[PDB]
Amino acid sequence: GSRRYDSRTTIFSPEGRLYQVEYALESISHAGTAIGIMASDGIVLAAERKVTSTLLEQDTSTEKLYKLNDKIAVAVAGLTADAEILINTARIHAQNYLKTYNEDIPVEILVRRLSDIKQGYTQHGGLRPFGVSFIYAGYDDRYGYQLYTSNPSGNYTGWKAISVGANTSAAQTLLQMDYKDDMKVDDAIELALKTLSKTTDSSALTYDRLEFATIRKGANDGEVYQKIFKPQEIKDILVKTGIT
């Protein structure tokens, strides 16, 4: 019968790893680097686009950074289309929680459910895993500012600063070197851009090859604001830290 053509996407190797998870991670390692840095007064998300053409429509574009709700955003490394499937799920999950409890969903709870969905594809159903790693940036009134990552294994962890995609090894070393606990958002912005600047596989880091977002306490008293940067705003903030 059909057994002949089944790759068996959910089995252990003799070493006890999950082939498809490992191979999905290998795929992700060639995607545009994305960085998240957490400050005491906000969070930065910065990410590098995949080798652009001059004709790409840069301002109506989105590939790396998506809004999950008003208090939570993600940066994507991996297959964009796989990521959109998970993002819509996550958006719906958030609204169900708000509908049930009349309260915005705590960041971890949203992160956990998405990670559980990923986990399921590694244990049953014989389908390939999602080729995606996320950096979650969000705020809630229990833990304040939070950063997490998840990858195709459905494993998630919390961070002060983290990268995913290409060159995370170099990026993690640079972040470790210059990160400090008492840091502010505007310092974190600079750290994120300088780190991408040094790990990038292109000759120089320009506005048109980036996506950028902040999550600040940055409006009127106690309430949180998400800013997905327009191209001109990235151009300015690139000059303002002297990379161009």
């Binding site: 068996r8 004709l55 790409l56 964009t80 796989d82 959109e84 499937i85």
Partner: protein, 250 residues
Amino acid sequence: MTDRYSFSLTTFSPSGKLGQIDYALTAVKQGVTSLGIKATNGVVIATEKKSSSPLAMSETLSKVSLLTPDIGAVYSGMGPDYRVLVDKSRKVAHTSYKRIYGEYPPTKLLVSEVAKIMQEATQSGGVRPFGVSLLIAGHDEFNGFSLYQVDPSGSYFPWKATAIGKGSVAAKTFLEKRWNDELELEDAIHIALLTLKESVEGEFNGDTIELAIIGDENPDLLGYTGIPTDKGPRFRKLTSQEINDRLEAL
């Protein structure tokens, strides 16, 4: 009996590639050239109607398809795969949008739905990916004019102008030289016709070229009058005669 193929036929190789998606893209490479160009007041999508025998009537085979009155699509790769995607894309515009909001979806959201369908053929059990890339041009009230490319993976990108298939490397280079943010629709039609001559072997006239625009509302194409707010489809297929008129002043 019944489908016992409930496992994925696209999977990760040890190097991280998804073989079936790569191979689908290869089928797209062999496909006949198609392109799209975005002007300030319109979008043009074009391709070559490469006929299989001269006994075939190639007006009965439309490569450029209306999806909504303000959205059109063209492709490169496997024609039959494209035909069923058009059927599904048309339907999803209604089921997942018009039947809910009483209006046609904006371009990026319809593109989003098509991309979803193509992504699922990349992960669901017992199917292969679609062997096509799409270029979708459209207009909607709050985004204006837009042009998108959709690939076998389900990934899509917005373009100022681009091309796909056979001679796409050369055609993307040609368009880089000629595109600016001030192009008026008529200029973009002319550039489209020039770019397409590069990749076409045989006859190059209005019977071998298929070309449509997303431009001004066409009240004469509506079919009725008396609702002031209904002004007509912005999608218009250029006729054989209209294409030849533009080929002499070329």
